[PDB]
Every structure is written in C-alpha cells, then in structure tokens.
Amino acid sequence: MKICSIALVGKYTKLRDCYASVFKALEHSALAINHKLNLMYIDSIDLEKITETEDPVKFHEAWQKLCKADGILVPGGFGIRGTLGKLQAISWARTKKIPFLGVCLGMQLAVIEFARNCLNLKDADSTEFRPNAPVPLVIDMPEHNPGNLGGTMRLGIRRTVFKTENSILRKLYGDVPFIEERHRHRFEVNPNLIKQFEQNDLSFVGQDVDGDRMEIIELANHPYFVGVQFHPEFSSRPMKPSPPYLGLLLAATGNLNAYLQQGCKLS
C-alpha cells in the first residue's frame, strides 16, 4: 500500500493508552482508503524554542517529523504543558497548507492561533491557565441544566447544529443538519469576540442547540483545516470511520474531492 504520514502533536513520543481511541479512528480512516497509517508521535514541548536551547537534537527530530507530515492532528489535551509547541504546529499547518484537525483543546488553540496571527489580537488567550488575560477569547462556560445545582461541564452526547450548507464536514457527515457526538469540555470561544472573525477566513460552521457555543471551525482557502470541540474518536468504527478523521486522511492523501464526487459512500 501507499503510506500516509500523520503527525500527532500531543504529550508523548509514542502510543499511550490515552490516545487509543484516536489511533483507532485514524486506522479506520486509513484502511478505508487503502493506505498504511504511519502515525508520528510528537511531544509538543520538543517543537518549542526552549528545547532548541537545551536539547537541539530532540528539537530537530520533532521538526523533521512535523515537516514530513502529510496531515497534522492536535488531539484533546492535558494542561498548560506544551501549549506553545502546539500553537507552532498549528501555525505550520495553517501557513504551509498541510491538512489539519484540532480536537477540543486543539480547536481552541486553533482559534487562538488565528486570532494572534491573522486578526492581530496579539494577547488572545484562554483564561483556563491565565484568568487575568487581557483578550479572553476562550473562557469558562458551564451548562446550567434542570435538576442540577450550579454549573457543570459540557458532558456526554450533545447535538451540534450546522450553521451553513457550505461546510466540508457537513458533506462528510452525509449532508445532515446536525450531528450527535460526545463532549468533555467547559471552555468555549467567547461570544463577545465572535464578531472579530466575520470578514476573515476562519468560520464557525457548527454550534450547540442554544447557539452560545461554537463547536466546529473551518478555514477557507486551505484544503482541510478543521477544529471540533467534541471527540469524534468515540463514534468511529471500521465501516463508518469518524468523518473528521476520514476527511483528514483523504485530504492528506490528495483524495478528498474524488470521495465527495463518488457520493460520500462511508458516511
């Protein structure tokens, strides 16, 4: 088979049990388009300047892996650790037009990266690990559901509704007006800052049922640059690969338009 190389920019330099569902979703997608998956694991701190100084061999190893990648994935995340590295990975994929998928934290970092470098909102940040942030672009937004005391994390299966008929993800999900996926997050794009994005290339193409939380992003003028707040891994299966992962492997291999034109068989 032809090989597809995908960089997973995360916490470790090898397969850990926290990425098992993620690996399985990529493999379903790979098999479904008759490619062998070569998943390169990159510890995101290695891509940072600090590592160039203290361990340049690791630094150049990380960047070589990132630069040979046909597709780049920033999955759901742990903490403040290696955030700058992930932003650099995202910057690379954006500017070099490499197929990109950001999941939960990876969507949020993608929003922040676009804000800093394409909207010139230089200090745009998440309040999660700096609550006194000047531009609070990503913020703590609990649900307040019936039968509970106080706010809670957005958890379990939820409906995401498409805001437009011109979304590549909508196509890949089989042209339905909404989807149901699993959530585990409390930080959201700040609604006070959404107006800033309207004349620019990053669009919010999916939202929760109430319309307060932006859940899917897509970058125009790029072959495939996608972020989702939910974890699409958890609904992937061999005969129905998770569309966002399928779209990444399709785009990484140069086969996306062909799949659209054959009628999205695997949706």
Given in angstroms, what resolution was this structure solved at? Answer: 2.3
CATH number at residue 203: 3.40.50.880
- 134 vs 47: CA distance, rounded Å: 26
- Candidates 184, 194, 60; CA nearest to 124 is 194
Question: Using only C-alpha atoms, what is the Rg of the chain?
Answer: 18
Report the residue count for the chain: 267
- Candidates 222, 211, 205, 207; CA nearest to 94 is 222
Catalytic residue selected from 181, 188, 218, 233: 233
Catalytic residue selected from 28, 35, 185, 231: 231
Task: Tell me which amino acid residue 61 is.
Answer: E
Catalytic status, residue 233: yes
Catalytic status, residue 4: no
Please calculate the CA angle 234-5-37 and round it to the nearest 5 degrees. 55
Domain range enclosing 209: 1-267
Catalytic residue selected from 104, 181, 183, 222: 104
In the sheet that holds 135-140, the strands lie side by side as: 124-126, 135-140, 187-189
User: What are the distances in angstroms from CA 73 to CA 49, 110, 123?
Assistant: 21, 11, 24
Number of domains in the chain: 1
SS3 245: helix
Question: DSSP labels for 117-160?
Answer: HHS--TTEEESTT-TT-SEEEEEE--B--TT-SS-B-EEEEEEE
105-118 helix and 83-95 helix, angle to the nearest 10 degrees: 60
Catalytic status, residue 231: yes
Q: How would you classify the pairing of strands 135-140 and 124-126?
A: parallel
